[PDB]
Amino acid sequence: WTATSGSCKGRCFELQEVGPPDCRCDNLCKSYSSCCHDFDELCLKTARGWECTKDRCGEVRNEENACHCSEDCLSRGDCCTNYQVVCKGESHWVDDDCEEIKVPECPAGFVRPPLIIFSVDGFRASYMKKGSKVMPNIEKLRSCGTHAPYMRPVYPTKTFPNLYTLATGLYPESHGIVGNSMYDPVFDASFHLRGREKFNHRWWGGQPLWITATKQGVRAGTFFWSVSIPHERRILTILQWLSLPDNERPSVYAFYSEQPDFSGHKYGPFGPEMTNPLREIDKTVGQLMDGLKQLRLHRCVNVIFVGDHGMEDVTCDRTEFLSNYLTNVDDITLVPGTLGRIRAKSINNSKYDPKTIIAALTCKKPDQHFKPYMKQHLPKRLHYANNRRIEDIHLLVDRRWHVARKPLDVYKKGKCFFQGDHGFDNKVNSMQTVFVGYGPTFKYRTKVPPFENIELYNVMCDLLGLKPAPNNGTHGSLNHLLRTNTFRPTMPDEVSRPNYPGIMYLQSEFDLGCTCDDKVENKLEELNKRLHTKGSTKERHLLYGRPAVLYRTSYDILYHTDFESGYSEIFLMPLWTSYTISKQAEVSSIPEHLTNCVRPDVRVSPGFSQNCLAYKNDKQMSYGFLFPPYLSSSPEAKYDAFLVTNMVPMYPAFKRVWAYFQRVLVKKYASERNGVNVISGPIFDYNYDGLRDTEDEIKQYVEGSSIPVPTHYYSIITSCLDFTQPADKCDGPLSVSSFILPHRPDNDESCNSSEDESKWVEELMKMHTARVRDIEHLTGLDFYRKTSRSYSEILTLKTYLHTYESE
Ligand SMILES: *[C@@H]1O[C@H](CO)[C@@H](O[C@@H]2O[C@H](CO)[C@@H](O[C@@H]3O[C@H](CO[C@H]4O[C@H](CO)[C@@H](O)[C@H](O[C@H]5O[C@H](CO)[C@@H](O)[C@H](O)[C@@H]5O[C@H]5O[C@H](CO)[C@@H](O)[C@H](O)[C@@H]5O)[C@@H]4O)[C@@H](O)[C@H](O[C@H]4O[C@H](CO)[C@@H](O)[C@H](O)[C@@H]4O[C@H]4O[C@H](CO)[C@@H](O)[C@H](O)[C@@H]4O)[C@@H]3O)[C@H](O)[C@H]2NC(C)=O)[C@H](O)[C@H]1NC(C)=O
Ligand SMILES: O=C(Cc1ccc(Cl)c(Cl)c1)N1CCc2ncnc(Cc3ccc(F)cc3)c2C1
Ligand SMILES: [Ca+2]
Ligand SMILES: [Ca+2]
Ligand code: NA
Ligand code: NA
Ligand SMILES: [Zn+2]
């Protein structure tokens, strides 16, 4: 119930939301059908449109008008945005030359530069260049301010997850808005674009910027706008709020445009009909900036122009139907479109089996345009699993395609409406969106590399003097965007110090069931091999210092000629193995006599070692090595690679991947990058939360043993950004690529896996590309502790994702 017979007189776009049944006058009242009876008359005035003209200049104030051209409008804060231009001979903001804003130039009583977020729905990154001729205000923001060539959204690349990620700094799995449509089985409730369940606060987790601000004494404009409030009125409302007295005036504001997404769905991302909505958005930016100029705030406010996601060409004819794969299609519920999520239609159906659904969807058609996954097997870079609102079965849809349950769903929702959609994998080029920052706190005429939208919350907090709530950004990684207000983090403190074991065990103390043909025997070289075991080559193989262990554990540093490792006494294998391969390095084979060689490590007790007999008896599990024997520096150094302390558990199907990486790809990268440093290791994430598992969370061991089975294997591959310098003698910035490969007992993910590894392994690794920060979370390790570089620069490096998309 609403008693809509209250009034909006003096309450138009009030900031505090009043409680039912009392009627409302705020920017969401329309969405709730709760506005007071006189809201349209008083708060949505339209008379005479949005622009002054010469004949209105100095008019007598008429309070029916949408905006004002009368002499008193400036002091009232309600002039049309073109008032000074039409009536006082001033220029539009866009026609003024760019001049660096070295310091805020703010009116008396401003405590801090305000922040205005200008968010555009469906604004694909390439519109900045492709539409630049019809967007002159946006182009001035972009060229005069700080911009990225693009900004990466989160997955799924849908509106609500991405706008709420912008506001929170959180992955969708953590904030809880995991799609535009959702079912929460604990609540037994559904969230939809249409309707009323989406208003309940239990959907919306984390802490959005407006709450963060309010909690710390900073006032916030409301970030949401009911669809029927015209854009011109949204802008005039912001400008009116900016004229409030100092004690009442918000410091942070957002504008939201439904364009160009709305037209992009109908016309495609580059439809000829797209020119007009891009023009109209630019006009709106112009209104804002002209309005700020009238208030003398154009060199005071920080403005962020940001999109939520891009837009791809998608049509009804590019739809895959689950009815063409599954016999039992009426036993499932599908969340359809540009991603798929499947669950049982009835929780009472005990014949529902996800294994059989996954199998019926795997590599069935030669050009199949989606791939099924248990959510825990999705690329870790997506961070899309750890929420009960994410169904166990996920379909990753190829760009340009849709998935649906049955054909009747697509023509009874038989011709086609739409030409554009989004939601795909967030590394897809067409899903990338925009970022521009303009203002005193941003840099002048500065291009920055692409970054992820999860990082902006921290920066917006920095722009407002707020302490961010706990989030998934890496605070400091965007310091290079800012003139001032940088956040200067310290490196985390190492929690566990390593042991440095010497030779403490005799060979005969080991009963590991291992054998090695190594009984093959000099004082020149004897001292020399001892030196290697004490760390004499470590400067070459450990280039950025040893990783810091950020949790409590027992581990040993093991040195060798060709590699260094941090060996866990708890997990019976390395946490990390580091080695450098020069451009000139040669690949060799595993000699015949060493094919099955595993050697006891006399620095590590039998009790903290793996054993070969476990692998013999586990018919499912084999082993591999972290430092690859193929890249040994000499026949004698090769023996080190067969130490039991370099061994890790590997399914034979995974060994195909791993061996190709080690034998072929590492050397290829060293040739292309002028040497690489590699750090490899295991990851255990059995509860798919993106964070390192403790010992008691491990669900699988090598049969009969205490040797835990990794869920994934990582590698971090670092070289010199200036590739004329070798990786091991680099004076300047670094370049990195990394992966987190799922450790799976089949290659069902790769439909072409019966072919030679040269046709499928590298494609797999690109899909599972990762940020160093992703690996940090998953291992509790902190990398790049000892470089010549600034810590902020290193944080940027750690957040880099190598995407393997072209321009
Ligand atoms: C990205 O950044 C975020 C934010 O930093 C990281 O997420 C944090 O991760 C922490 C560890 O996983 C987690 O800490 C836990 O907090 C519990 C209290 O949580 C509530 O309060 C906080 C603070 O206000 C609030 O933010 C939480 O909000 C979540 O839950 C509500 C639903 O009620 C949602 O609205 C909201 O969207 C959010 O959901 C997300 O997080 C939860 C997990 O909290 C997931 O289940 C969801 O799927 C979703 O992803 C909460 O309202 C606290 O109780 C936990 O403590 C347990 O574990 C510790 C281990 O040290 C143990 O010592 C304790 O005993 C305790 O265990 C007991 O409970 C167990 C389970 O019932 C039981 O098994 C035991 O036997 C014990 O009885 C824990 O400390 C923190 O909440 C989240 N924060 C958020 C906002 O998500 C995230 O990790 C980052 N991601 C990456 C990849 O780095
Ligand atoms: O205003 C809207 C349309 C809208 C209208 C009425 C209702 Cl009843 C609802 Cl629910 C939505 N929307 C779109 C969805 C959305 N999802 C999450 N956050 C926001 C706010 C926001 C704005 C800018 C920004 F950079 C970050 C966040 C937004 C903003
Ligand atoms: Ca959107
Ligand atoms: Ca985990
Ligand atoms: Na075996
Ligand atoms: Na396969
Ligand atoms: Zn859309």
The pair of structure tokens assigned to 349 is 């159906």
The pair of structure tokens assigned to 539 is 């400067």
Q: Which of 442, 508, 516, 452 is nearest to 480 (CA)?
A: 442
* Host H or E run for residue 769: strand 769-770
Cis peptide before 230 (omega within 30 of 0): no
The span from the CA of 692 to the CA of 342, in Å, is: 28
Q: How far is C-alpha 765 from the geometric centre of its chain's CA atoms?
A: 18
- Ligand 1 binding pocket includes 383 (Cβ within 6 Å): yes
How many A from CA of 367 to the centre of ligand 3?
A: 29
CA atoms within 13 A on the CB side of 362: 17
| Cβ-count burial 590-612 (b if 16+ within 10 Å, e if not) | beeebeebbbbbbbbeeebbbbb
Q: Around Cβ 59, how many Cβ atoms within 10 Å?
A: 16
- Give ∠ CA 236-148-449 in degrees, rounded to 5: 155
- Ligand 2 binding pocket includes 338 (Cβ within 6 Å): no
Instruction: Locate the ligand 2 atom nearest the alpha carbon of residue 208 and give its number.
Output: 27
- With beta carbons less than 8 A apart as the criterion, state whether 418 and 336 touch: no
Map 340-398 to HEC letters.
EEEEECCCCCCCCCHHHHHHHHCCCCCCCCEEEEEHHHCCHHHCCCCCCCCCCEEEEEC
Residues with CB under 5 A from ligand 3 (ion): 121, 159, 261, 308
Most distant CA pair in the chain, distance: 105
Q: Which of 298, 284, 177, 309 is nearest to 230 (CA)?
A: 284
- With beta carbons less than 8 A apart as the criterion, state whether 183 and 389 touch: yes
For residue 734, the cross-strand partners are 720
Q: Which of 293, 279, 21, 336 is nearest to 139 (CA)?
A: 279
- Ligand 1 binding pocket includes 105 (Cβ within 6 Å): no
How many A from CA of 254 to the centre of ligand 2?
A: 9
Q: Which of 176, 160, 241, 250 is nearest to 213 (CA)?
A: 250
CA atoms within 13 A on the CB side of 14: 17
Which residue bears the tokens 């890249």?
A: 631
Q: Around Cβ 754, how many Cβ atoms within 10 Å?
A: 9
Helices (H), 682-801: 761-767, 772-779, 791-799
Which residue bears the tokens 């060709």?
A: 562
Cis peptide before 156 (omega within 30 of 0): yes
Q: Which of 159, 419, 429 is nearest to 313 (CA)?
A: 419
Q: Which of 629, 628, 726, 618 is nearest to 671 (CA)?
A: 726
* Host H or E run for residue 531: helix 523-533
Q: Which of 212, 207, 211 is nearest to 174 (CA)?
A: 207
Q: How far is C-alpha 320 from the geometric centre of its chain's CA atoms?
A: 28
**Positions at the binding site:** 121, 159, 180, 261, 265, 308-309, 422, 685, 687, 689, 691, 693
The span from the CA of 360 to the CA of 353, in Å, is: 11
The span from the CA of 158 to the CA of 156, in Å, is: 5
The span from the CA of 585 to the CA of 632, in Å, is: 9
Q: What are phi and psi of 302, to 5 degrees?
A: -90, 125
The pair of structure tokens assigned to 142 is 């972009």
The experimental method behind these coordinates is X-ray
- With beta carbons less than 8 A apart as the criterion, state whether 643 and 610 touch: no
Q: Which of 279, 286, 243 is nearest to 92 (CA)?
A: 286
Question: Which member of 4, 81, 157, 159 is catalytic?
Answer: 159
* Host H or E run for residue 653: helix 652-660
Distances from the Cα of 604 to the Cαs of 380, 527, 804, in angstroms?
33, 21, 41
**Positions at the binding site for Zn(2+):** 121, 159, 261, 265, 308-309, 422
Which residue bears the tokens 């984390």?
A: 206
Which residue bears the tokens 């972290």?
A: 626
Ramachandran bin of 241, using left for φ above 0, alpha for ψ from -120 to 50, beta for the remaining angles: alpha
* One-letter amino acid for residue 20 of the chain: P
- With beta carbons less than 8 A apart as the criterion, state whether 176 and 389 touch: yes
- Ligand 2 binding pocket includes 198 (Cβ within 6 Å): yes
- Give ∠ CA 97-100-101 in degrees, rounded to 5: 120
| Cβ-count burial 168-206 (b if 16+ within 10 Å, e if not) | bbbbbbbbbbbbbbbbbeeeeeebeeeeeebeeeebbbb
DSSP code string of 132-148: GGG-HHHHHHHHHSEE-
* One-letter amino acid for residue 131 of the chain: G
- With beta carbons less than 8 A apart as the criterion, state whether 339 and 428 touch: no
Q: Which of 400, 381, 386, 239 is nearest to 317 (CA)?
A: 400
How many A from CA of 385 to the centre of ligand 1?
A: 14
Q: Which of 694, 734, 687 is nearest to 711 (CA)?
A: 687
- What's the first-to-final CA gap in the chain, in angstroms? 54
Residue 454's SS3 state is helix
The span from the CA of 179 to the CA of 198, in Å, is: 12
Instruction: Locate the ligand 1 atom nearest the alpha carbon of residue 204 and give its number.
Output: 35
- Ligand 2 binding pocket includes 192 (Cβ within 6 Å): no
DSSP code string of 100-117: ---S----TT-SS--EEE
- Ligand 2 binding pocket includes 166 (Cβ within 6 Å): yes
For residue 643, the cross-strand partners are 599
The pair of structure tokens assigned to 572 is 């019976």
How many A from CA of 226 to the centre of ligand 2?
A: 9
| Cβ-count burial 763-794 (b if 16+ within 10 Å, e if not) | ebbbbbbbbbbbbbbbbbbbbbbebeeebbbb
Residue 568's SS3 state is strand
- The ligand that comes nearest to the alpha carbon of residue 433 is 3
- The ligand that comes nearest to the alpha carbon of residue 688 is 4
Active site residue 159: yes
Q: Look at ligand 2, atom 22, and give the residue with the nearest C-alpha.
A: 223
Q: Please, which residues have CB within 8 angstroms of residue 76's CB and are 6 or more apart in sequence?
A: 68, 243
**Integer Rg of the chain from CA:** 30
Q: What are phi and psi of 647, to 5 degrees?
A: -90, 145
- The ligand that comes nearest to the alpha carbon of residue 746 is 6
- With beta carbons less than 8 A apart as the criterion, state whether 345 and 332 touch: yes
Asked whether the CA dihedral 322, 325, 330, 333 is positive or negative, the reply is: negative
The pair of structure tokens assigned to 62 is 């008429």
- Give ∠ CA 395-399-400 in degrees, rounded to 5: 115
For residue 568, the cross-strand partners are 555, 573
**Positions at the binding site for 1-hexadecanoyl-sn-glycero-3-phosphate:** 159, 180, 261, 422
What angle separates helix 275-294 from helix 231-242, to the nearest 10 degrees?
20
Q: Please, which residues have CB within 8 angstroms of residue 780's CB and are 6 or more apart in sequence?
A: 549, 550, 551, 692
- With beta carbons less than 8 A apart as the criterion, state whether 568 and 553 touch: yes
The span from the CA of 254 to the CA of 249, in Å, is: 14
Cis peptide before 260 (omega within 30 of 0): yes
Q: What are phi and psi of 383, to 5 degrees?
A: 45, 50
Q: Which of 76, 127, 93 is nearest to 84 (CA)?
A: 93
